[PDB]
Amino acid sequence: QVPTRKDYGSKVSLFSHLPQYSRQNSLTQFMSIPSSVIHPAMVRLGLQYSQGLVSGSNARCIALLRALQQVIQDYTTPPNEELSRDLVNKLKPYMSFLTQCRPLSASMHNAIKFLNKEITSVGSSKREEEAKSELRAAIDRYVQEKIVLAAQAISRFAYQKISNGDVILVYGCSSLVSRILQEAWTEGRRFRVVVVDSRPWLEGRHTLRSLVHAGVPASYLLIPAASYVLPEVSKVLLGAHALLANGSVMSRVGTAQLALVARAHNVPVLVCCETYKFCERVQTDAFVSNELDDPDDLQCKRGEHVALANWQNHASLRLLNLVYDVTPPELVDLVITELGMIPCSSVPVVLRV
Amino acid sequence: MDDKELIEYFKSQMKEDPDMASAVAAIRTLLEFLKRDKGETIQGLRANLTSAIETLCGVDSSVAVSSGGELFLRFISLASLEYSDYSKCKKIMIERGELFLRRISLSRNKIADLCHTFIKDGATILTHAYSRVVLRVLEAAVAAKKRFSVYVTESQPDLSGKKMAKALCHLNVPVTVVLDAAVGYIMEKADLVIVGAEGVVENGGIINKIGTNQMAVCAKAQNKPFYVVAESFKFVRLFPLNQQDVPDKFKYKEEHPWVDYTAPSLITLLFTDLGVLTPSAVSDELIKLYL
Amino acid sequence: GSELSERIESFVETLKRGGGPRSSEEMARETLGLLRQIITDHRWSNAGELMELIRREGRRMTAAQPSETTVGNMVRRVLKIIREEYGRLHGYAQLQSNIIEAINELLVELEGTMENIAAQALEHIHSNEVIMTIGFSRTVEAFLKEAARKRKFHVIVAECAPFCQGHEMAVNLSKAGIETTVMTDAAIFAVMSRVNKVIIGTKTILANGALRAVTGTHTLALAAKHHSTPLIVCAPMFKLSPQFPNEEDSFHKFVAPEEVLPFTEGDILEKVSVHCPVFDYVPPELITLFISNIGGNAPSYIYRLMSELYHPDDHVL
Amino acid sequence: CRFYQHKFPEVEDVVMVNVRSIAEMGAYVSLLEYNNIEGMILLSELSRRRIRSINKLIRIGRNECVVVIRVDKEKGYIDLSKRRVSPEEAIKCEDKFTKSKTVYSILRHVAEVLEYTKDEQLESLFQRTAWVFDDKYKRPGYGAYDAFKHAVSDPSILDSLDLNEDEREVLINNIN
């Protein structure tokens, strides 16, 4: 089937059960060149998941759905097989390939679960190509009316909670918040923005540029100085990777601590998320479900010396950097979604049904 | 027809009786307006109701009346119409309105016999304002023969808490009209807090007379319980995050507000005619009540 | 016919005093057996008549020992089921057998809630950890020696004082190689700084997550609100009740004062008004995460579940 | 322009409307059967179950059939529905909608060769030409379509009421 990627050196004692992956030793070194054992769309999409060319959540979900559509409408039926079975069996190894390449988010898992429900929902009364086009149009209509129309409704809602004068705090390359701002700024409301980024995957700069190029006065500053600007900040507008069952909004590694000092200075947090980033497992602390991207990139060029050149030759040393933290539902005060505005401790009683 | 007598009839009814709350008089005025509609449409009524609501939001600004109008206009169009001749619609809609106003009327009685089991006999009710629902809660808490001392803060913007104190000691309860500035003091000896409610925002904390929020946090200071009683039609879909976020048509009516917001992390339980709710449940039942 | 009444009286009596059925599973199970017996071996024209009858018998069964509501919530759920079947057959002929098959479904689910919780366990624990419980519930010991056969954590159980009940667990779990440490309840806080999470049982989950557990846990809920270590409440879904916390505080179970101050003490028992409650109330806000045979949940989902199972009208039972 | 020379739509008629908003008591959407009428398709019982409708702004734009359950054009009141229509009326309404689309497109592209001074010129030209043709075809709505479809045989079908040279020019240019 598919080989397995190596572990990159020492993990954290508490996080041994999680993978210490590496974004250099890509799997595609040892596959079939004119990919047949693997689809071309899957080898390509995984290969560009390992090269970071897809970062956000909506971005990963859309890239996944596009590559899966390219798999679908380039697939013929083996002898005497109903689509509902052979297709999902064809799908499983590709999803395992992706999960081997870059551990899937909640958006990828939501899309995969929906796509399994759809592949199995196709019938025997429908011919091959007609029902294949049906599933194709189903993927398309979902990826439209549950993410893009979603974000537009999120804008129509959030526009209410941005009055004239109040600055706003955000975090990193969460596409939804940039759209919220560049959509509620044209309609008149005026404000500022205080983007906040971290290391070494510095990713506030993306929303920074997308805010500069929209006429919105920004101001960028690393998160070990967030405690500074929180006096002024009147709303925090976090991008919410994945809601959870209890209400604990999992998001990027800063979101939690940011909401912490935010509630400390008593500024009302607002995480923005859509009604499909709701993988309904639960995760009490921040450790029972995370990842670990290539940690060997934390280092920084400092004059002539980089303090971690020989990362490994210091045995008892180990590095890490999570890629997901979690805000418990005490801190957060808004879940803006296409259902309206719901308090964070009431995520499940309205998103389970 | 027009406000020229609609508003006058509204004021006359709402001021015929103090136990008659405000927004229920608003509902009754909307109903009599329907009973004097003289028109042929439904759309024009989905607009004329909003017209009456916007001429009602001036004579009264309390969240009560906006909630009543919006929720009533919502629920009235719930039993699928499939219009016949703009008359079957009339009968079924006035029937829905009659049923809704009767639900409204018995809301207070239901919340009365649902609340009275919470004053642990020999305790200290600490109310905050003349509030018909808290009044007819304490009445059914002394009718079931418990005993309790009641501290009614005075609500400085208008010394009306004294009205609650008088009408309450009319029922032979040990009343003590504290200084509304002293809600940091008597909170050492308040076994529970029963504040009247004038509308609930989504997340659970409520809009209430100015001196509520402080009292609210004082509760959470000294780990006392904080109990509210929101009549059934006191739900609105705002969602403030700080006392300035609430609409300006609500607060005012030098610079000093009249109502303000108690965050939900302070309220321990809510008592509505929809039962007993931890605030998350009021978010849920507000979404699924407006529908 | 009279066999009905005799097993009713046997049940009521062994309820008032009888130690055992031990696991609340077993209490609910024999309750369900008695429910089946009542609901097949009696006379009723309409279904509402059976609603009224079983309401009477449940009222007696609960007002017998109101300190235990597993039987009460079982009665309320059975009343929900009769409401369901009457609604289905109204919008009368053989609905009896429909009742019985739904009850058999309920019972086969009940018989496996423990393994549901077991399978859900391992997604919350990982090695190099220390976990703290209190008292003794069969659910928690299943949980722990289930998660034990994959990895070896360090459990710290705090023996309750009114009964060294936790002691038993600390023996049982010591029979899975699980690093059990027994501490005296008083010393909870003394080690509360090195307990990564707590796993507490219950005997009720009131209608706002305000569980009511074995005594010596409100202190645990507060010492884990303090350190912000989380409360895994391992409460099988059938332990709920639509009752709310502030109700007349005949709420604990005031066991005989011989547990605390033995009778052989002496004269000082003239005016020493000893006390002994075995149920500590716990408030919602301290409760972090509920487990149940459905999955994981938040103390705000409990009202959804209560409006789900027990038809909100029969809370008065 | 106004695709029908009648004052208001017909009683128990069938029109196609573009769902725009999702209001409280009914979707306040717009159609064109009487120069962009504004109807309120009343939300039903299990249709009001949109309380959990993913992106309740759905139907932001889409065509859908609606029958005029009640009407009073004294000020522009129309109350539609969505459960009184069936695939027969649905197919017929699709037919009438396609016909109105083609007719309006042809007529607008034709009168576009004149750059009318004001909308009153559009109304007068439409009235005269299309209304005369449809009334001669002994059917309201089924007249201009049949006329523009028979103009594929001889563009002087109704040359007795000869409208103008630019009309026949553009018509035989980009219709037949």
From Swiss-Prot, chain A:
Disulfide bonds: none
GO molecular-function terms, A-Z: guanyl-nucleotide exchange factor activity; translation initiation factor activity; translation initiation factor binding
Activity: how regulated: Activated by the chemical integrated stress response (ISR) inhibitor ISRIB which stimulates guanine nucleotide exchange factor activity for both phosphorylated and unphosphorylated eIF2.
Keyword Nucleotidyltransferase recorded: no
Subcellular location: Cytoplasm, Cytosol
Keyword Nuclease: no
Residue numbers spanned by region May bind the chemical integrated stress response (ISR) inhibitor ISRIB: 5-14
Any one GO BP annotation for this protein: regulation of translation
Keywords: Acetylation, Cytoplasm, Disease variant, Initiation factor, Leukodystrophy, Phosphoprotein, Protein biosynthesis
Record's GO cellular component terms: cytoplasm; cytosol; eukaryotic translation initiation factor 2B complex
Effect after changing residue 300 to R: In VWM4; with ovarian failure
Outcome, altering residue 324 to H: In VWM4; with ovarian failure
Main location group: cytoplasm
Subunit composition and interactions: Component of the translation initiation factor 2B (eIF2B) complex which is a heterodecamer of two sets of five different subunits: alpha, beta, gamma, delta and epsilon. Subunits alpha, beta and delta comprise a regulatory subcomplex and subunits epsilon and gamma comprise a catalytic subcomplex. Within the complex, the hexameric regulatory complex resides at the center, with the two heterodimeric catalytic subcomplexes bound on opposite sides.
Homology family: Belongs to the eIF-2B alpha/beta/delta subunits family.
Official protein name in the record: Translation initiation factor eIF2B subunit delta
Organism encoding this protein: Homo sapiens
The gene coding this protein: EIF2B4
From Swiss-Prot, chain B:
GO biological processes: cytoplasmic translational initiation; oligodendrocyte development; response to glucose; response to heat; response to peptide hormone; T cell receptor signaling pathway; translational initiation
Lineage: Eukaryota, Metazoa, Chordata, Craniata, Vertebrata
Modified residues (N6-acetyllysine): 35
Family in the record: Belongs to the eIF-2B alpha/beta/delta subunits family.
GO MF term set: guanyl-nucleotide exchange factor activity; identical protein binding; translation initiation factor activity
SUPFAM superfamilies: NagB/RpiA/CoA transferase-like (SSF100950)
Origin: domain of life: Eukaryota
Keywords of this entry: Acetylation, Cytoplasm, Disease variant, Initiation factor, Leukodystrophy, Protein biosynthesis
Gene Ontology cellular-component annotations: cytoplasm; cytosol; eukaryotic translation initiation factor 2B complex; membrane; plasma membrane
Disorder noted: Leukoencephalopathy with vanishing white matter 1: An autosomal recessive brain disease characterized by neurological features including progressive cerebellar ataxia, spasticity, and cognitive deficits. Brain imaging shows abnormal white matter that vanishes over time and is replaced by cerebrospinal fluid. Disease severity ranges from fatal infantile forms to adult forms without neurological deterioration. The disease is progressive with, in most individuals, additional episodes of rapid deterioration following febrile infections or minor head trauma.
Subcellular localization(s) per the UniProt record: Cytoplasm, Cytosol
From Swiss-Prot, chain C:
Keywords annotated in UniProt: Cytoplasm, Disease variant, Initiation factor, Leukodystrophy, Protein biosynthesis
Quaternary state and interactors: Component of the translation initiation factor 2B (eIF2B) complex which is a heterodecamer of two sets of five different subunits: alpha, beta, gamma, delta and epsilon. Subunits alpha, beta and delta comprise a regulatory subcomplex and subunits epsilon and gamma comprise a catalytic subcomplex. Within the complex, the hexameric regulatory complex resides at the center, with the two heterodimeric catalytic subcomplexes bound on opposite sides.
Reported impact of residue 179 to G: In VWM2; with and without ovarian failure
Alphabetical list of PANTHER family matching this protein: TRANSLATION INITIATION FACTOR EIF-2B SUBUNIT BETA
Species for this entry: Homo sapiens
Compartmental location: Cytoplasm, Cytosol
Annotated disorder: Leukoencephalopathy with vanishing white matter 2: An autosomal recessive brain disease characterized by neurological features including progressive cerebellar ataxia, spasticity, and cognitive deficits. Brain imaging shows abnormal white matter that vanishes over time and is replaced by cerebrospinal fluid. Disease severity ranges from fatal infantile forms to adult forms without neurological deterioration. The disease is progressive with, in most individuals, additional episodes of rapid deterioration following febrile infections or minor head trauma.
Pfam family, one: IF-2B
Source organism superkingdom: Eukaryota
Any Gene Ontology biological process: translational initiation
Swiss-Prot record, chain D:
Record-annotated S1 motif domain positions: 12-83
Family: Belongs to the eIF-2-alpha family.
Keyword Acetylation: yes
Organism of provenance: Homo sapiens (Human)
The protein, known as: Eukaryotic translation initiation factor 2 subunit 1
Sites bearing N6-acetyllysine, chain numbering: 136
Chain coiled-coil ranges: none
Task of the protein: Member of the eIF2 complex that functions in the early steps of protein synthesis by forming a ternary complex with GTP and initiator tRNA. This complex binds to a 40S ribosomal subunit, followed by mRNA binding to form a 43S pre-initiation complex (43S PIC). Junction of the 60S ribosomal subunit to form the 80S initiation complex is preceded by hydrolysis of the GTP bound to eIF2 and release of an eIF2-GDP binary complex. In order for eIF2 to recycle and catalyze another round of initiation, the GDP bound to eIF2 must exchange with GTP by way of a reaction catalyzed by eIF2B.
GO annotation, cellular component aspect: cytoplasmic stress granule; cytosol; eukaryotic 48S preinitiation complex; eukaryotic translation initiation factor 2 complex; extracellular exosome; glial limiting end-foot; membrane; mitochondrion
Gene expressing this chain: EIF2S1
